[PDB]
Write an enzyme that holds these catalytic residues in place. Structure first.
Site, PDB file in Angstrom:
ATOM      1  N   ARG A   3       0.851  -1.183   0.000  1.00 34.44           N
ATOM      2  CA  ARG A   3       0.000   0.000   0.000  1.00 34.44           C
ATOM      3  C   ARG A   3       0.890   1.237   0.000  1.00 34.44           C
ATOM      4  NH1 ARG A   3      -3.309  -0.241   5.021  1.00 34.44           N
ATOM      5  NH2 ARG A   3      -4.398  -1.974   3.970  1.00 34.44           N
ATOM      6  N   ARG A  68      -2.188   5.420   9.431  1.00 33.90           N
ATOM      7  CA  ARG A  68      -2.641   4.997   8.113  1.00 33.90           C
ATOM      8  C   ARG A  68      -2.818   6.228   7.233  1.00 33.90           C
ATOM      9  NH1 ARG A  68      -0.555   1.084   9.597  1.00 33.90           N
ATOM     10  NH2 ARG A  68      -1.411  -1.045   9.649  1.00 33.90           N
ATOM     11  N   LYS A  99      -3.534   0.695  15.468  1.00 33.96           N
ATOM     12  CA  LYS A  99      -3.313   1.669  14.401  1.00 33.96           C
ATOM     13  C   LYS A  99      -4.227   2.887  14.529  1.00 33.96           C
ATOM     14  CE  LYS A  99      -5.801  -1.440  11.412  1.00 33.96           C
ATOM     15  NZ  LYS A  99      -5.754  -2.385  10.272  1.00 33.96           N
ATOM     16  N   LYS A 101      -6.078   6.352  12.625  1.00 36.41           N
ATOM     17  CA  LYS A 101      -6.675   6.822  11.376  1.00 36.41           C
ATOM     18  C   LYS A 101      -7.163   8.261  11.477  1.00 36.41           C
ATOM     19  CE  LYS A 101      -7.667   2.343   9.568  1.00 36.41           C
ATOM     20  NZ  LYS A 101      -8.653   1.301   9.177  1.00 36.41           N
ATOM     21  N   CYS A 313     -15.299  -4.404   0.749  1.00 36.15           N
ATOM     22  CA  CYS A 313     -13.858  -4.524   0.952  1.00 36.15           C
ATOM     23  C   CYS A 313     -13.286  -5.584   0.010  1.00 36.15           C
ATOM     24  CB  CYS A 313     -13.547  -4.958   2.384  1.00 36.15           C
ATOM     25  SG  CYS A 313     -14.065  -6.691   2.725  1.00 36.15           S
ATOM     26  N   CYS A 319      -7.242 -11.442   0.920  1.00 34.78           N
ATOM     27  CA  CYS A 319      -7.249 -11.164   2.349  1.00 34.78           C
ATOM     28  C   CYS A 319      -7.173 -12.442   3.177  1.00 34.78           C
ATOM     29  CB  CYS A 319      -8.491 -10.383   2.764  1.00 34.78           C
ATOM     30  SG  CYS A 319      -8.383  -9.914   4.489  1.00 34.78           S
ATOM     31  N   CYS A 358     -15.385  -9.649   6.826  1.00 40.00           N
ATOM     32  CA  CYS A 358     -15.281 -10.157   8.185  1.00 40.00           C
ATOM     33  C   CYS A 358     -15.529  -8.964   9.102  1.00 40.00           C
ATOM     34  CB  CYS A 358     -13.915 -10.823   8.418  1.00 40.00           C
ATOM     35  SG  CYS A 358     -12.578  -9.665   8.764  1.00 40.00           S
ATOM     36  N   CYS A 362     -13.564  -3.330   7.228  1.00 37.50           N
ATOM     37  CA  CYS A 362     -12.923  -2.487   6.215  1.00 37.50           C
ATOM     38  C   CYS A 362     -13.883  -1.904   5.188  1.00 37.50           C
ATOM     39  CB  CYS A 362     -11.857  -3.293   5.476  1.00 37.50           C
ATOM     40  SG  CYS A 362     -10.692  -4.127   6.573  1.00 37.50           S
TER      41      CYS A 362
END
Ligand code: SRM
Ligand code: SF4
Ligand SMILES: [K+]
Length: 449
Positions: A3, A68, A99, A101, A313, A319, A358, A362
């Site tokens: 990414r 991110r 993380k 954001k 997603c 994934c 899941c 996302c």
């Protein structure tokens, strides 16, 4: 975990040509995948960092870096706020490099889905001039199935800050969460210590006191598909790209088309939080040439308002955490939803409808009017009752059901909406008003039945 860091989704045409070449030549899947955080991904890398560096791009050091990509509203109604807002998103992005954001949002658009994020700077003006931000903190969507100790949470208002405090505030929030974190996401820390306690520490660290919130309201989260008039003689063309997946398909050479546009376009591209692409800053006289390529490559193929406002997603095949298909399920799922909208005479309407593979979330299903959350192959939890603007978490309506069961339920419910809705009333709001689903008022306490 490749990414790219790309604050605000802004990418140059020279950069685009490089990533186009890399995707086609050096990856298994051959695609560029636009993500819903305004950047892009390669899948199945077979020199990648060398490639990125060669055009001035860097990738986040995921091993240690938990920040991110920083989002910025891509195509604001007041076009003259974009430049300054983007400058700040970039400065925040650079400030946070070693993380969590972060977004910069320009009312009335919540395209960046601020309530999914730890830290949000809501642009405030006086005079077509950016003057400061409202800070909202503590959004995040990930849950664990059946675990009432986890929850999606919206972000809370802390207050207003003039521009001069932006970076110190950004640093104070990120460090406070890292430090106080256990269940270690900001949303949990905020609930554990209390909003006022967290806010007071951010004030102490940044050396500021928050002022009263300044007025803002959101009207939607969608992109502005097609041409929009920008400032001066400039125009922005937003192309709907299903799932952000850029590859050449039969009759629809999307990747080749975008390369050809990159070669002639005088400005930049912008990757949106809805996994679409803007050809930004086109002079009026160049519109026809750009549109010709886009139309001929399938990039301007008309879709329903519903499809424009649906998202999934990545999920399978790449994934490792996936439970149910999302990206690969969405096109046929939305074919079926389009059929239901047409059945009920609401083909011109939309429902913000999202599928996540899941419960990590996302696809941002936990801010949808209708959300599907993968539980197992072919099976999803169905959530109802978010709103169009994305300020409410949808409660679970039916658990662990298959597509035919979902479709039968939505047939009934969309049918009721079409007949019973009030003027301009969204589907999510309708399901709450009609008593189909109870709203979520305070997720840490009332998300779970
Ligand atoms: C590509 C993207 C979905 C998309 O179709 O656009 C995505 C894809 C993945 N996310 Fe994400 N997330 C993406 C936006 C999100 C968002 C939505 C957002 O930020 O706007 C969330 C929900 C909001 C939130 O964070 O609360 C999100 C929450 C997660 C989580 C749960 C984190 C948590 O708080 O518990 C994981 C799992 C983890 O980190 O352990 C995760 C993990 C992953 C990974 C890297 C799986 C992994 O850990 O190995 C996914 C890679 C799939 C693949 O093969 O490409 N991703 N992920 C998004 C890339 C954004 C980006 O450029 O950085
Ligand atoms: S929601 Fe789950 S399946 Fe979808 S990309 Fe994120 S981690 Fe993978
Ligand atoms: K899209």
């Amino acid at each position: 975990l490749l990414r790219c860091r790309l604050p605000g989704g802004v990418i140059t045409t020279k950069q685009w040509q490089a990533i186009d070449k890399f995707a086609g030549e050096n990856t298994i899947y051959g695609s560029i995948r636009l993500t819903n955080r305004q950047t892009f991904q390669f899948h199945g890398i077979l020199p990648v960092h060398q490639m990125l560096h060669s055009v001035g791009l860097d990738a986040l050091a995921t091993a240690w870096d938990m920040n991110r990509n920083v989002l910025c509203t891509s195509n604001p109604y007041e076009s003259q706020l974009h430049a300054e807002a983007y400058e700040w998103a970039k400065k925040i992005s650079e400030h946070l490099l070693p993380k969590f954001k972060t977004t910069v949002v320009i009312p009335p658009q919540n395209d960046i889905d601020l309530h999914a994020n730890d830290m949000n700077f809501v642009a405030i003006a006086e005079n077509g001039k950016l003057v400061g931000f409202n800070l909202l903190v503590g959004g995040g969507l990930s849950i664990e199935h059946g675990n009432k100790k986890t929850y999606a949470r919206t972000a809370s208002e802390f207050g207003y800050l003039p521009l001069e405090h932006t970076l110190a505030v950004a640093e104070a929030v990120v460090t406070t969460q890292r430090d106080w974190g256990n269940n270690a996401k900001t949303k949990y820390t905020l609930e554990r210590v209390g909003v006022e306690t967290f806010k007071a520490e951010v004030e102490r660290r940044a050396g500021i006191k928050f002022e009263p919130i300044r007025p803002y309201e959101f009207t939607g989260r969608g992109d502005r598909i097609g041409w929009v008039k920008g400032i001066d003689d400039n125009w922005h063309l937003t192309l709907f790209i299903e799932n952000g997946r850029i590859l050449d398909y039969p009759a629809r050479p999307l990747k080749t088309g975008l390369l050809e546009i990159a070669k002639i376009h005088k400005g930049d591209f912008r990757i949106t939080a809805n996994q679409n692409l803007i050809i930004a800053g086109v002079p009026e006289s160049e519109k026809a040439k750009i549109e010709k390529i886009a139309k001929e490559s399938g990039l301007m193929n008309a879709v329903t308002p519903q499809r424009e406002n649906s998202m999934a997603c990545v999920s399978f095949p790449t994934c490792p955490l996936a439970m149910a298909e999302a990206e690969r399920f969405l096109p046929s799922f939305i074919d079926n939803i389009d059929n239901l909208m047409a059945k009920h005479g609401v083909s011109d309407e939309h429902i913000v409808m999202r599928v996540t593979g899941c419960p990590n979330g996302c696809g941002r299903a936990m801010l949808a009017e209708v959300g599907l959350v993968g539980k197992a192959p072919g099976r999803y939890n169905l959530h109802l009752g978010g709103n169009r603007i994305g300020t409410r978490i949808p409660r679970m309506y039916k658990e662990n059901i298959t597509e035919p069961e979902i479709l039968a339920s939505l047939d009934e419910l969309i049918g009721r909406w079409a007949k019973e809705r009030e003027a301009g009333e969204g589907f999510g709001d309708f399901t709450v008003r009609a008593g189909i689903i109870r709203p979520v008022l305070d997720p840490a306490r009332d998300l779970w039945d």
